[PDB]
Amino acid sequence: VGDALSYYVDYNRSHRVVLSSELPQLPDTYFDGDEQYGRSLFSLARKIGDRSLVKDTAVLKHAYQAIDPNTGKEYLRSRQSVAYFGASAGHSGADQPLVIEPWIQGKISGVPPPSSVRQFGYDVARGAIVDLARPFPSGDYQFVYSDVDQVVDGHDDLSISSGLVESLLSSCMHATAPGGSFVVKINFPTRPVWHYIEQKILPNITSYMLIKPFVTNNVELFFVAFGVHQHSSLTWTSGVYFFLVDHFYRYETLSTISRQLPSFGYVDD
């Protein structure tokens, strides 16, 4: 029970350089039967409000505190253009993410309202239906936010998982204007993914940050990219290393536990 906690990390030049290949991999058993059971039970027995909200408000507050050295001021300024990639109508009957309205009305401290917010995604209501994994008609946005999900049934399908992340990332880049920033939610962090970002993205962004709003036990992650389309020499750091290691360990230990509990609505004999 209770509010959710957030774990994060950001780029620090003074940190020792690390290569994707040295970063922790996603457990090869993450998709085994019981592993799923564990994650489900935990999810069901967890008492909390609308999830997608707590998560968004969280990252949003964090991303708004990032300061650009070449300005001494925030990468995310108020009154800028926004795009919410993968917006969902939800059964709540709000017809859009719960974050939006509060955000726009300035009810969220530390996160000043934007100028406008466009919504895209298959499950949209106040937006346009599109396959964000491919090019589509839109403008330039100073801030792109993507809660777009990645789905996989088995482990050998992680190829697909990662592949979409690639396409999503790329799509964001193209949609984000120069000097802007974007966020991309990643369901299953894999080396191939870390490598890709490393090779094709870190070198073209001023800074980055990783966030984890802990609500349910899983590996889900939030990658934030600041100052887009500007050559740099960024790389994975030690902080990142440590961060992930803890991140995966946490999950791992909780799983082995929740895995020993009874079915949700079981019959005790």
Angstrom CA distances, 178 to 74, 125, 202, 204, stand at 15, 29, 14, 10
68 binds its own copies (CB under 8 A): no
Q: State which of positions 72-111 bind its own copies (CB under 8 A).
A: 77-81, 88-93, 95, 105-109, 111
200 binds its own copies (CB under 8 A): no
> Applying CB under 8 A, which of residues 134, 156, 233, 260 lies at the interface with its own copies?
134
Least distance in angstroms from the C-beta of 56 to its own copies: 16
> Applying CB under 8 A, which of residues 15, 52, 68, 122 lies at the interface with its own copies?
122
47 binds its own copies (CB under 8 A): no
Interior/surface letters 73-100, b for 16+ CB within 10 angstroms, e for the rest: ebbbeeebbbbbbbbbbbeeebebbbbb
- State the Rg of the chain over Cα: 19
Q: Which is nearer to its own copies, 2 or 265 (CB)?
A: 265
How would you classify residue 140: left for phi > 0, otherwise alpha for psi between -120 and 50, otherwise beta?
A: beta
Sequence-distant (6+) residues with CB within 8 A of 235 are: 17, 18, 19, 198, 202
Least distance in angstroms from the C-beta of 265 to its own copies: 6
Least distance in angstroms from the C-beta of 241 to its own copies: 32
48 binds its own copies (CB under 8 A): no
Q: State which of positions 150-189 bind its own copies (CB under 8 A).
A: 151, 153, 157, 174, 177-179
Residue 61: what are its φ and ψ, rounded to 5°? -60, -45
Binding residues vs its own copies (CB under 8 A): 33, 36-37, 39-41, 43-44, 77-81, 88-93, 95, 105-109, 111-115, 120, 122-125, 127-131, 134-140, 142, 151, 153, 157, 174, 177-179, 229, 263-267, 269
